[PDB]
Ligand binder design. Sequence first.
Ligand code: CLA
Ligand code: CLA
Ligand code: CLA
Ligand SMILES: CC1=C(/C=C/C(C)=C/C=C/C(C)=C/C=C/C=C(C)/C=C/C=C(C)/C=C/C2=C(C)CCCC2(C)C)C(C)(C)CCC1
Ligand SMILES: CC1=C(/C=C/C(C)=C/C=C/C(C)=C/C=C/C=C(C)/C=C/C=C(C)/C=C/C2=C(C)CCCC2(C)C)C(C)(C)CCC1
Ligand SMILES: CC1=C(C/C=C(\C)CCC[C@H](C)CCC[C@H](C)CCCC(C)C)C(=O)c2ccccc2C1=O
Ligand code: SF4
Lengths: 31, 742, 466, 147
Amino acid sequence: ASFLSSIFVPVIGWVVPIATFSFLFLYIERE
Amino acid sequence: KKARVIVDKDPVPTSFEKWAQPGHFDRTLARGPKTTTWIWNLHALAHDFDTHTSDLEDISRKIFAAHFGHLAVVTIWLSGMIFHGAKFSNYEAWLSDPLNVRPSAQVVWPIVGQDILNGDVGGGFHGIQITSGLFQVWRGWGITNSFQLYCTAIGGLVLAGLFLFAGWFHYHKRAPKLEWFQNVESMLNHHLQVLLGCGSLGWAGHLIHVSAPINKLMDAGVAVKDIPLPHEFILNKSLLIDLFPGFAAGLTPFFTLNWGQYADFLTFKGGLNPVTGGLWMTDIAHHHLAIAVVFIIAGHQYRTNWGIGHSIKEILENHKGPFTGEGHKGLYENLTTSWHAQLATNLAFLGSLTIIIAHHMYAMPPYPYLATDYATQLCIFTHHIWIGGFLIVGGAAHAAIFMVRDYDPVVNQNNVLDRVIRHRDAIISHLNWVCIFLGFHSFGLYIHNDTMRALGRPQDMFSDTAIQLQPVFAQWVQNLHTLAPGGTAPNALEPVSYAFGGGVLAVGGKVAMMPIALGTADFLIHHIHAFTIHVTVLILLKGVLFARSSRLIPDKANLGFRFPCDGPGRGGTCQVSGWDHVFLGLFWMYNSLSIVIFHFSWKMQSDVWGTVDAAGNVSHITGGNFAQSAITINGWLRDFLWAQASQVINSYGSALSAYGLMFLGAHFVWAFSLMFLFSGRGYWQELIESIVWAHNKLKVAPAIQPRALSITQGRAVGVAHYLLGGIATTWAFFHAHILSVG
Amino acid sequence: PQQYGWWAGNARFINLSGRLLGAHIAHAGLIILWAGAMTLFEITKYNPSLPIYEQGLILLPHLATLGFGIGDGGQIIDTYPYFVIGVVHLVSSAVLAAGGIYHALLGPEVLPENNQFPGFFGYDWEDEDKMTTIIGIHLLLLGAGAWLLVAKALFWGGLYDSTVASVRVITEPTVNPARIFGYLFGAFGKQGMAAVNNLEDVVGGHIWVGILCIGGGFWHILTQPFAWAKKVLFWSGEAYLSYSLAALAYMGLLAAYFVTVNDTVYPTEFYGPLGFSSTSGVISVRTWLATSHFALAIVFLSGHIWHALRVRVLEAGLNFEQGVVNYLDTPELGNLQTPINTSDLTLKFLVNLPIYRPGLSAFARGLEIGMAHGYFLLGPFVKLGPLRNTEFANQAGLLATIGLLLILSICLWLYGSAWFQEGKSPQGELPENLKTAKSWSEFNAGWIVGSCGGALFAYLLVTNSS
Amino acid sequence: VGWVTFYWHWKHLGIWQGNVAQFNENSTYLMGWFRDYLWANSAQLINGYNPYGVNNLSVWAWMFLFGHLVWATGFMFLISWRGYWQELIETLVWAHERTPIANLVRWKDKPVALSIVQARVVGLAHFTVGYVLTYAAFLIASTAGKF
Ligand code: CLA
Ligand code: CLA
Ligand code: CLA
Ligand SMILES: CC1=C(/C=C/C(C)=C/C=C/C(C)=C/C=C/C=C(C)/C=C/C=C(C)/C=C/C2=C(C)CCCC2(C)C)C(C)(C)CCC1
Ligand SMILES: CC1=C(/C=C/C(C)=C/C=C/C(C)=C/C=C/C=C(C)/C=C/C=C(C)/C=C/C2=C(C)CCCC2(C)C)C(C)(C)CCC1
Ligand SMILES: CC1=C(C/C=C(\C)CCC[C@H](C)CCC[C@H](C)CCCC(C)C)C(=O)c2ccccc2C1=O
Ligand code: SF4
C-alpha cells in the first residue's frame, strides 16, 4: 500500500495544482 | 572675470534677541506654536536655509558660517580625544609594550557600581579599552609622552576657538558676496594646492623629519625615555644621519635631480615593517611627497586671474558626443547655482572614498601595531564603511532635493541630465531586472545550499567540495598584484598588500596580514554585495529620476521633495516623494553594509587573523570555518551570529558588561522602531484625542494642542531608531567579541 | 577633407589615392627600418654564453627558428646570416622611404584612372572590381611568400626542429587535407592550429595556405563580386579599413595564442619556457611577444569596432551632431529610436525570426520556435540535475526537458484560451496569422512537436558523442 | 502570546531538567531570557544540519530559517508602501511593451501595486506565518532535542 505515496504525493504536488490553477486562470479571465 | 575678496561689512547685527524667538528664521514658525507639530517643524527646518530666505547670497553666507561651526565642534572633539589621551589613558605604558598593553583612554567614575567597566587593560591602568586606533595614530605621529598630547589638545582648543570666531566673523562682521563663493576655479586651485598639496607636503615634512626617525628608533627597541625629542633630529643632524645616511647629502641632491641620494628615507619598499606590522614610514614619507607634487601641479589647472588655466565651463561644454546630445553643457550652472548639486556630488564621492579608505586601511595597515590590534582593525573598517554608506545615501537625497528645487529646464535642455530624465523608464526597468537577476543568482544559491545541506545532499551544493563557483577574475588579479614587485612594479620589494599574496607576515605571535584566498564562499558573498548595492542604487536612482514627476503623479515637483503621498487615489500614492526613496534606500544601505561588515568580520577571523606557531603554522580565530559554513544562511546564523554572540551575552559581571547592556538596549531601540514603521498617524491622533479628553477632564489640557507625529516624521523616527538600534547592536556584538578573541 | 582637424589629419586623403598610396609605402619603410635596424641592434649585444630568451632579443629568435647559422642543441655559431638579413631590410627601408616621400607630396594628389598602364594603378572606392583585383594581386604574393618558406624548409637548408634540437631538412610534407584542416576543427588537441607538434604539419600547412592564397589570387582578379556580397557589406573606403582592422586583430590574437602555448614553431631554447616565465628576474622573450601582441590585438579589435561603427552611422544618413538617438516620428510615443531597437540589423533579424517571419504557417512558426527552445533546454537538466553524475544523467535530463516543455505547452493553451473569447483578438505584437483560435492551436501543436523533437535531437547528439 | 509561551516553555524546561534554579535566578533580568532561553536552547536546533551532516532536527532547522525569512518578508509590505511600487511597476509595464519578442504576449489584467489595505493584510500575514513557524520550530526542536 506504501506505493500509493508514489502516486498521491506527485498528484497533490503537480496534477492538482496545474488542474486547479489552469481552471481558476480560465475562470478569472472568462468574459 | 577676476577672482577677488569682496565682502559686505556688518551684514547681520549680533544680538541674543533672536535666541529668545524660537522659529524666527521661518515666516510660518515666526507666528509661534499652535500645535506640537510646530516644535518638530522648528528642528526639521532649522538648517534648511533655502526655506529661510530666497537670496542665494544670504544662503551661501549661512552655509559658510555654519561650516566654521562644524569645524569648531570637530576640532573640540579631536582635541578632546587627544586630551583624554594625555590625561586619562595608558598611552605611555602602551608605547613601552604595544603587544601586551591594551589601549584605553576612557576612565569611568565609581558610582552605582559602574566602575566594573574600568577593566585591567595592562600598564597598571584601569579603564575602557578604546577601539578608535588613536594610540596607533599618535605612535605614527611620533608622539612619545603625555606633554606632547597636552600641547596638541590645547592647540586644538585654540583652533576650535579660531573656527568659532571665523564663523561668527564671516557671518556677522565680514560676509563674502555671492561673487566670492562662485569662484569655483580659484577654490579648486587653493583646495588642491594648499589644503591637499601643501598639507601633504607639510605632512611629508613631519614624516621625514619627526615620525620616521622616532619610529625607526622605537622599532630598534630603544626605550621611549632614551629616544631624542623630535626637535633634536633637526638641531642635532648627527642623530638623524645615524638613522638615515641620505641626510649627509643635504638639500643639493633635491635641486640637482640626484634624488637617488634620498633612497634610504624615501623608499618604495611595499609590504609592512616586520617589527610593527604597519606600512614603512619611509614609504609613507615618499607617498605624501609624491602626492604633494601631483596636487600642487594639479591645482594649477584652473584659470583664476592670469589667463593661463582651464575654465571648467568650457571643458564641460566641449565634452559632448553622438549619444549625449549637448553632453555636459548646463552642468556648470547646476553646480554653481545649486548648493544641493554640490552637496549631492560631495556626499556621493566622499562616501565612496570613505569605503575605499576602509578597504585600503585593513589590507595595508598604515599605523604601527594596528594590524595585530584586531579590535581596532575590525572597528575602524566597520566605522568607515558605515560613515561611507550614510554619506552616499545623503548624496542621493541632496541629488533628489536638487531635482525638485534647483533643477532648471532651460539650463538643462538636451544635456546629459535632460537625456537621462528622458530614458529614466529604460534605466530603472533595466536596473530593476539586474537587481532581480542578482537577487536570484546570489541569494537563491544560499537557499539552494541551505536546502541541499538540510536534505543531506552536500554533493549538490554550491561549494569548493561540490559545484564550485571560483572567482577566477579576482583570483587572476590577486596573482598579478603578487607578481608586481620585480615585474610590472620593478622598484617594489614586496606587494602593496600581503592580502593579494606573498607570505604570512606575523608581529608578536599574531598574524598582521596574510593572503586572503577567494573561493566559492567569496564568489557568493561578492555577488550578494553586488546585489545589495544595485538594489540600494535602484531605490535612490528611482528617487532622483522620478522626484519631479512620474506616470502616476505628473506634478510631483509642486508637491515638493518631502511630502507623505498624494492620497489613497490612483490605487494609493504612499511614499512617491524623493524623500521616501531616501527613507527606503537607508534600510537597503543598512542591509547592504551589514552584510559587508559581517563578510569582513568572519572572513578575517577564519582566513587571515590568528596566532602563528614558531614553525610558522597559522591557527585562525575561527579555524577556517568560512569556506564550508558561509555558503548557507544556517551557517551564518550558527557559526557567525550564534557562535560569536557568546562573548556579548556572557559579558555581565565583567568589564565588557556595558557591551552586553548596549546589545540588549540596541535590540530594544530596533524593535521600538517597528511601532513607527508599521503604524500610521491616524491611529495615534485618535488615541491622543482620548488622552487629551482626560487632560481636559482634569483641566490640564495644554495650549499647544498635542498632535501625532507627521506621516513623514513617523517614517523619519522609524528609520532613525531602526538604523540606531540595528547598527548599535552590531557595534556591541563586534566590540564584545573582538575585545575577547582579537 | 578640410573638415578634419590636424589630430584626424590622415583622414583628409581618404578619397585622394596618391597621398594614401605614398602613406602606405612610407609606413612599409618604417616597419622595414625597424626590422632591419633592430636586427643589427640585437646582433651588437648578443652574449653567446647567456641564453637568448633572458637577454631581451626578439628578432634573433625569429631568424633562429628558420635555421640561419645554428649547430647542434640550438647554439648560434655564425651571425653573418642575421647581418645580411638585417642590412637587406635596412637598405629596402631606404628604397621604400624614397618611394613614400615621392608619392606623398611630389607625385600627384589623385592617381589618374585611364586605359594606359599608369591608369591601372588609379582606383575609386565605388568600383568594386578594381579592389577585388588588388586583393587577388597581393594574395598571389602572400602565396609566393608561403612557398618561399616551404622552399627554405625543403631545398635551402631547412628549419630548426625542437624535437632533436637541430636544423633538419624537410623532405615529406603533410599534403593530407584531413590532417592539416583538422587543426581548424580542433581534431589534434584543444589548442587547435596552435597544437602543431612537428615541422611536417607546419610545412604541410604552408603548402595548403600557399595554394589557397594563389587559388584565391586567380579567383579575385578574374571575377567581380556577386549580388549577395553587394548587399551584406559596406563599400566606403573606411569600410575596407575596418574589415582589415578586424583581420589584423584576429591575426594578432592568433599569434599571441601561438607564442603562449606552442613550442614547436617557437622553440624554448630561443623564446624560453611555455606560458609566462621570468628567469633570474628577467622577463622571457615569449612573455614579451605574447603579452604585447595580445594587448595590440585588443587595441586593433577596438580599431575595427570604432571604424566599423563610424561607417554604419555615416551609411545610415546620420551625422555626429544630431547623433544616433531620435524620436519615433511621433515624439509623444513612449519608446526612443536607438541603435539597439531601430538599427537595420536589429529590425532585419527580429522580422526574420520564426514568430515574425513572413510566409510561415502558424504550425511552422511553433515548430521552429519549439525545435530551438527544446534543443537548448536539454543542457541544464542533463548536466546540473540530481542524477548528473550517474549513468541515467542524459535520460533523466531528457524526461525533465519533455516535462518542462509539456507545462510550457499548457501555458500556451491557457494563454490562447484566455485571449481567444469569440471575436476579441489577443493584444500584443502578434503576426497576422496567430490572431485566430485555430491558428493558436496549430501554433501550440507546432511548439509541442518542435520542442519534443528539439529535445530528442539534442539527446541523440549528447548520448552519441563518439 | 510570545511572552506567555516563552515563560511557559522556559519555566517548564527548568522543571523538566530538574533545574528550576536556572529560571528562578535568571528570569528577573532580560539578558537571562536572551542567553539562558533563546541562545542556550537554539544550540541543537541550528545544528539540525551543518557541514558535518544532518539529524532528525534538520526539518526544524530549515523551518526555523523559513520562519525568519517569511517574517522578514512581511517587513517589506509593512515598511515600504504602495506609491513606491506603483511607480516601479509602471517602468516594468514600459519595458514589457518595448521588449521586441516579449511584447508578443500581453496581460489580460493591468499590473498594479497591491492596495494600501492589501499590503497591510499581506504584510501582517507574512509577519504572523513567520512568527508561528519560527517559534513552532524552536519550541519543538529545543524540547525534542533534549527529550
Ligand atoms: C510537491 C510535490 C513535488 C514532487 C513529488 C517533486 C518531485 C521531484 N522534483 Mg521537486 N520541486 C517541487 C515540488 C515537487 N517535486 C517544488 C514546489 C519546487 C520549487 C521549490 C521543486 C523544485 C525542484 C528542483 C529545482 C528540482 C526538483 C526535482 C524533482 C525530482 C527529483 C527526483 C530525481 O532525482 O529523479 C530524476 C527525475 C527526473 C529527471 C524527472 C522525472 C520525470 C518528470 C517528473 C516528469 C516527466 C513527464 C510527465 C510524465 C508529464 C509532464 C510533467 C507534469 C505535468 C506531471 C522529482 C521528480 C529535480 C529534477 O529532477 O527536476 C526535473 C530538480 O532539479 N524539484
Ligand atoms: C527577507 C526579507 C525580504 C525579501 C526576501 C525581500 C525581497 C525583495 N525586495 Mg524587499 N524589502 C524588505 C525585505 C525583503 N525584501 C524590507 C524589510 C524593506 C523595507 C525597507 C524592503 C523594501 C524594498 C524596496 C524599496 C525594494 C525591495 C526590493 C526587493 C526585491 C529585490 C529583487 C530580488 O532580489 O528578487 C529575487 C527574489 C528574492 C531574492 C526572494 C527569494 C527568492 C527565492 C529564494 C527563490 C524562489 C523560490 C521558489 C521558486 C518559490 C516559489 C515556489 C512555491 C510557490 C512552491 C526582492 C523581491 C526591490 C525591488 O523590487 O527591485 C527589483 C526594491 O526596490 N524591497
Ligand atoms: C536561484 C538560483 C538557483 C540556481 C542557479 C540553482 C541551480 C540549481 N539547482 Mg537549485 N534551488 C534554488 C535556487 C537555485 N538553484 C532554490 C531557491 C530552491 C528551493 C529551496 C532550490 C531547490 C533545488 C532542488 C530540490 C534541486 C535544485 C537543483 C539545482 C541544479 C539543477 C536545476 C536545473 O536542472 O534547472 C534547469 C534550469 C533551467 C532549464 C533554466 C536555465 C536558465 C538559462 C541558463 C538562462 C539563459 C538565459 C540566457 C543566457 C539569456 C538569453 C540568451 C540570448 C542568446 C538570447 C542547479 C545547479 C537540483 C540539483 O540536483 O542540484 C545539483 C535539485 O534537485 N535546486
Ligand atoms: C595635529 C594637530 C594639530 C597640529 C598640527 C600642526 C602642528 C600642523 C603644522 C603644519 C605645518 C608646520 C605645515 C607646513 C607646511 C609647509 C609647506 C607646505 C611649505 C611649502 C614650501 C614650498 C612649496 C617651497 C617652495 C620653494 C621655495 C620657497 C624656494 C625654492 C623652490 C621651492 C619650490 C622648493 C593642532 C594643534 C592644530 C590640533 C589638531 C591636531
Ligand atoms: C551569439 C549571438 C546570437 C546567437 C546565440 C544563440 C541564440 C545560440 C543558441 C542556439 C540555439 C538555441 C540553437 C538551436 C538549434 C536547434 C536545433 C539544431 C534543432 C533541431 C531539431 C530537430 C532536427 C528536430 C527533429 C525532429 C522533430 C522536429 C520532430 C520529430 C522528431 C525529430 C527528431 C525528427 C544571436 C543570434 C541571438 C544574436 C547575435 C549574438
Ligand atoms: C507611537 C507613534 C506616535 C505617537 C508618538 C508621539 C506623538 C511622539 C511623542 C513623544 C514625545 C517624546 C513627547 C514629549 C513631550 C514633552 C516634550 C516631554 C516633557 C517632559 C521632559 C522635559 C522630561 C505617532 O504620532 C506616529 C505618527 C506616525 C506614524 C507612527 C507613529 C507612532 O508609531
Ligand atoms: S495611507 Fe497615509 S501615506 Fe498612504 S495615501 Fe493614506 S495618508 Fe497618504
